[PDB]
Write the structure tokens for this entry.
Amino acid sequence: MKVAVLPGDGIGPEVTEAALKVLRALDEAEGLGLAYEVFPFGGAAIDAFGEPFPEPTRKGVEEAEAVLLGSVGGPKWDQNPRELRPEKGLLSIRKQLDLFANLRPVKVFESLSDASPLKKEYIDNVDFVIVRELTGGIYFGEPRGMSEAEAWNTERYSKPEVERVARVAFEAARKRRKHVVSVDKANVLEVGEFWRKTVEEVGRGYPDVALEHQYVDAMAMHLVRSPARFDVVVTGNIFGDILSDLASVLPGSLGLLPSASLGRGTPVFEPVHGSAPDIAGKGIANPTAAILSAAMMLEHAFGLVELARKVEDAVAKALLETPPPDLGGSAGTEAFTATVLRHLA
Amino acid sequence: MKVAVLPGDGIGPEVTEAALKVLRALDEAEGLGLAYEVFPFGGAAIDAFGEPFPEPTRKGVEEAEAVLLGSVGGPKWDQNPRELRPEKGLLSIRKQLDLFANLRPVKVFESLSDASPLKKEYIDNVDFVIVRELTGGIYFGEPRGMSEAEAWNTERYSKPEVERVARVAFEAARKRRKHVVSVDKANVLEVGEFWRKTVEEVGRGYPDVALEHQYVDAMAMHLVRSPARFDVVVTGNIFGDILSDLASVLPGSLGLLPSASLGRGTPVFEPVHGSAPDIAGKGIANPTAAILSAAMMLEHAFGLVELARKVEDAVAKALLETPPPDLGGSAGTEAFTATVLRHLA
């Protein structure tokens, strides 16, 4: 199991190590053959090598089997130009590794129901994964423009760009509850028609996985009214981006959520959360999304579906037994990684 | 006060009359000079005149000052062609009266908190109006298409189409809490940039109304996390359509919500809800959205802001004192209109 580890800036060093401690425990315990190396990335690499993603790191993530990525960003770098600010690097590891699907799961962890905005009975059992197409659609499609008089933007998709994210989604579904929902506007737009017939084609090949289709406006109401009725959801870019942000409020007690870019190259796995400089070095950072990005690496980069579910259960039990400071508890990063490890045995 | 009344099909006869009983009480009481006439529209007009919007009705709504519209639709008519099915008529009264903005308010009526999906503390005080642009953007913009290979759709807006819906929104805001929020994707799309600079221009002229801007993905999270922080929200078409459907789940105990198309011609005001044939003739239909569409006519078609707030308060008190069958109560249409009237005195 070859992992390029990119701890990044701010709390990325602390929280990526809490994740590596889980992955070493399991490795010791199961014999997984973890081999990992730590590479420079982010504001720390702008400081050291003069650019955010320097060619040792380019090579590193190009030769590994998985990237564990922490977080970059810090104010210190906003001042200077564009390709020398921590976030440029995030599009270059995305371009280089040809990543085209972003997977964002939402789980509302039983113990933390009361922090959710929805009454308990709506969040019970929420476990779904929205795989968003990443590189296409209106954000990048063309023609585009702006006059004194008018502005325009095209939303475009080719059969290839739709089949790529649909196969991620069906394969993605084989590992968890086997149901895909695709999301479109096919009753009004033709891009939506086209998406719908292509995902139904690509669906033929994955017969053990059920497929349903839904409109974006109707899926927006179903993520508050019945979110538990979904396992994997697959959608285009702007709709995946609106819909994953709406889905991120369901857990409530934020900062617990993981992310994984997937594609032709090396899968990248990060927590959804920033550098959080304010608390870097203090021990208090909540490692739950980092530890859960590790579990997504195990499930998508190494096929180890059974073990990823054991790490998500240990972090469930752990959030129940020692909530971190940020959930009305007092467990630092280390005492929390501890109780996670203590249930992996 | 000249009102063409179009009761439509199914429960539209019953619920439009509960609305006219409020408007006659107030008229008697305030001397408003209600003059109203009832015109054929909908499946009943397809049955009688052979088309859903027949030229007496075309004239009727073209000569009145407001339309009270009930609901059309019924299965009986789906079988036959396109311009002879109850819903075609709904686009023709929209085209004819040049309506370009749809106003959808959401209020979570204190007494009905517990039916909402969000915990009480998120819905307390929700009162906002999303004015959606109606005739433009990607649903109608062009070019558009579908090949074996790809599909496309343009999202287009001209300065006129944006200033029209922005002035509705600011004027719309003068009558309630004076704050507009516009909604776009201006950090990624140029149509969104263009919308944002135009709404900020048109904002100069309305200096007593505050203006804020927000991204669609961030407004989607704020309608579940803090919906009370909004009064009037103004957005394009597909985003208004997704965002009003997400906002409709906040009240929970549905079917209570009103709608108003506005424009160059005669304003149209309906409840958001169908014909509901199942219960047409039985007395049980909940008139709350009909009575509240009347109150929106008073506020937007006759400027009678003070009275529209008295009808929304009487229906608040009434929902508290006699919930209709559809909210775990037993009050039919008439006993509910009654307690509304009984607080208007």
Summary: The radius of gyration of chain B is 20 Å.
